[PDB]
Design a protein around this ligand. Structure first.
Ligand SMILES: CC1(C)O[C@@H](CN)[C@H](CNC(=O)C(=O)Nc2ccc(Cl)c(F)c2)O1
Ligand SMILES: *[C@@H]1O[C@H](CO)[C@@H](O)[C@H](O)[C@H]1NC(C)=O
Ligand SMILES: *[C@@H]1O[C@H](CO)[C@@H](O)[C@H](O)[C@H]1NC(C)=O
Ligand SMILES: *[C@@H]1O[C@H](CO)[C@@H](O)[C@H](O)[C@H]1NC(C)=O
Ligand SMILES: *[C@@H]1O[C@H](CO)[C@@H](O)[C@H](O)[C@H]1NC(C)=O
Ligand SMILES: *[C@@H]1O[C@H](CO)[C@@H](O)[C@H](O)[C@H]1NC(C)=O
Ligand SMILES: *[C@@H]1O[C@H](CO)[C@@H](O)[C@H](O)[C@H]1NC(C)=O
Ligand SMILES: *[C@@H]1O[C@H](CO)[C@@H](O)[C@H](O)[C@H]1NC(C)=O
Ligand SMILES: *[C@@H]1O[C@H](CO)[C@@H](O)[C@H](O)[C@H]1NC(C)=O
Ligand SMILES: *[C@@H]1O[C@H](CO)[C@@H](O)[C@H](O)[C@H]1NC(C)=O
Ligand SMILES: *[C@@H]1O[C@H](CO)[C@@H](O)[C@H](O)[C@H]1NC(C)=O
Ligand SMILES: *[C@@H]1O[C@H](CO)[C@@H](O)[C@H](O)[C@H]1NC(C)=O
Length: 339
């Protein structure tokens, strides 16, 4: 017998003690080892309500990731709330590792196993576990990277689809690789991302058709972001410690709805912090080839307002609230207190 409750979680990982990589270093000091034989109890005839949009597990993961970046990715110059902090900004080893979120004694995590669960409402197939699956704290905008896939159909998630101010999370059921490179040899900040256009446009077509199910068969249109900071108008992410900003205009044109798509990218030293606390400047890129190959497993979208009297709905890539990134992985979990 249980009830919804919030409590302080702990984390578990397979971090290596001898690694200089910062996620490994952080988890070594902040997490415990994983359980090799974890127990999972599938509940019979239990109906539980979930709400991915009001889930304190998300706030707690955000707190960890902020602490990790605070300790590991200090900028040379930090501009915050009128203040100016300077410090050493060495180059680091950076590659996110899976982090498990776990309940202490007296509490348990309920997990929704409904295969096309949208993140809110009743779940029929519920199990109880001590820990979530391993979640890589990948920070990005526009495209969700290296995440878990939907098991059956593509899923559309939103706190309120009817409200265009609410972010939409698209959960893909098939990965599309994105290959990002700053080549060895020039403009040391010039880079690019390569994507299979045949694969991408097929998935995007599938996304279009799913969006139709939720928008009364209205015509679905993609357009590039309207305005805002570069972190939002561009697909921004971190590869090997370096901040990449990629132009996704070619990804979100409605015309291809086959060759390789080459997005122009740029490494930026000066960024608007996702922690929402001002600006930071980092050192120039390391030398040599900088390359990250990632699976696109999700998309963050914002819907255009003012389209009620037309047959079109317009969607633009978005993001910037990194909590939505954690939601995309934590949607199926909630914490309960046990008697
Ligand atoms: C436009 C406004 C006020 O709302 C937020 C997005 N809706 C945006 C702040 N968000 C950010 O600055 C941000 O995410 N930056 C950021 C920095 C590095 C990386 Cl790798 C990233 F993926 C994002 O600022
Ligand atoms: C719940 O599990 C049962 C048994 O596998 C399955 O028949 C049913 O489709 C599942 N319900 C959902 C919504 O996934
Ligand atoms: C990338 O996607 C493929 C296919 O879904 C998967 O096998 C692989 O583990 C993924 N890599 C990640 C999540 O880092
Ligand atoms: C992915 O989901 C779509 C519906 O959104 C479905 O048409 C398609 O068969 C699915 N693909 C895979 C690989 O499961
Ligand atoms: C999720 O499902 C519930 C009912 O099961 C519904 O109220 C809600 O509109 C759905 N959300 C989305 C984004 O489809
Ligand atoms: C969803 O958003 C619409 C449009 O803003 C609003 O009218 C409605 O009250 C919202 N629904 C809920 C459940 O809050
Ligand atoms: C990434 O793209 C580069 C060419 O830009 C290629 O040499 C490399 O093999 C690619 N990586 C993968 C895994 O395809
Ligand atoms: C592009 O996508 C198709 C369809 O999946 C795939 O078969 C093909 O190998 C890809 N092209 C390249 C250059 O790998
Ligand atoms: C869209 O059209 C299909 C085919 O006519 C129809 O079966 C379905 O009810 C419609 N879906 C909507 C409006 O969500
Ligand atoms: C992306 O590229 C297009 C040209 O392909 C350009 O017109 C547009 O302004 C670019 N977007 C951003 C955010 O710079
Ligand atoms: C969208 O992609 C198509 C591919 O043929 C291209 O013709 C068109 O110029 C692109 N639109 C952009 C990049 O704004
Ligand atoms: C995604 O996972 C791959 C494989 O571990 C990794 O090489 C790549 O750097 C990851 N991408 C990001 C953005 O972390």
């Amino acid at each position: 017998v249980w009830k919804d409750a919030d409590t302080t979680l702990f984390c578990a990982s397979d971090a290596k003690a001898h690694e200089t990589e910062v996620h490994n270093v952080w988890a070594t000091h902040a997490c415990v080892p994983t359980d090799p034989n974890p127990q999972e109890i599938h509940l019979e005839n239990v109906t539980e309500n979930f709400n991915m949009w009001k889930n304190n597990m998300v706030e707690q993961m955000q707190e960890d990731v902020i602490s990790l970046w605070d300790q590991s990715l200090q900028p040379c110059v930090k501009l915050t709330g009128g203040s100016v902090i300077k410090q050493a900004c060495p180059k680091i080893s950076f590659d996110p590792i899976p982090i498990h979120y776990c309940t202490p004694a007296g509490y348990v995590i309920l997990k929704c196993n409904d295969k096309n669960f949208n993140g809110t409402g009743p779940c029929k197939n519920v199990s109880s576990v001590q820990c979530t699956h391993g979640i890589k704290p990948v920070v990005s905008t526009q495209l969700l990277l290296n995440g878990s896939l939907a098991e059956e159909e593509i899923i559309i998630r939103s706190e309120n689809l009817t409200n265009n101010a609410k972010t939409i999370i698209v959960h893909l059921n098939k990965s599309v690789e994105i290959n990002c490179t700053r080549p060895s040899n020039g403009d040391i900040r010039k880079a690019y991302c390569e994507i299979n256009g045949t694969k991408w446009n097929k998935v995007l077509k599938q996304v279009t058709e799913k969006l139709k199910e939720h928008f009364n068969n209205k015509t679905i249109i993609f357009q590039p972001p309207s305005g805002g900071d570069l972190e939002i108008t561009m697909h921004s992410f971190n590869c090997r410690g370096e901040f990449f900003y990629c132009n996704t205009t070619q990804l979100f044109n409605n015309t291809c709805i086959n060759g390789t798509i080459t997005l122009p990218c740029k490494i930026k030293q000066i960024i608007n912090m996702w922690q929402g606390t001002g600006q930071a400047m980092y050192a120039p890129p390391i030398d040599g080839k900088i390359n990250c190959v990632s699976n696109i497993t999700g998309i963050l979208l914002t819907r255009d307002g003012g389209a009620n009297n037309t047959s079109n709905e317009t969607f633009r890539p978005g993001g910037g609230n990194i909590k939505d990134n954690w939601r995309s992985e934590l949607y199926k979990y909630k914490v309960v207190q046990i008697e």
